């Protein structure tokens, strides 16, 4: 009787720990997906910002150049 109680409680605990492990795996997978998406987003932003400040630098250089030509 006590053995059946120990076995039932252990099976219940193993079921609950399986649920907890599945929940932890799902949470870690979602966090991985989101962190990787934000990493790709920051990298894309950094790249396109590099390009955009490059364009701004070029146009400001042309402005300053003809500018200088003016006076």
């Amino acid at each position: 009787e006590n053995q059946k109680l120990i076995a039932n409680q252990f099976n219940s605990a193993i079921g609950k720990i399986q649920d907890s492990l599945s929940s932890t795996s799902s949470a870690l997978g979602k966090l991985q997906d989101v962190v990787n998406q934000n990493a790709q987003a920051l990298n894309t932003l950094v790249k396109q910002l590099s390009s955009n400040f490059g364009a701004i630098s070029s146009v400001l250089n042309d402005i300053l150049s003809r500018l200088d030509k003016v006076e």
Binding site: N2, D19, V34, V59
Partner: protein, 37 residues
């Protein structure tokens, strides 16, 4: 001059509140699996 468009750059959000709630629920329910001989 037409600067590059960055308005599409978006960062997702994570919603693992279901899983955190399940973890706390299991940490509370494991007291129902303790053995009392």
């Amino acid at each position: 001059v037409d600067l590059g468009d960055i308005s599409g750059i978006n960062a997702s959000v994570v919603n693992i509140q279901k899983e955190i709630d399940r973890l706390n629920e299991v940490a509370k329910n494991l007291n129902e699996s303790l053995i009392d001989l």
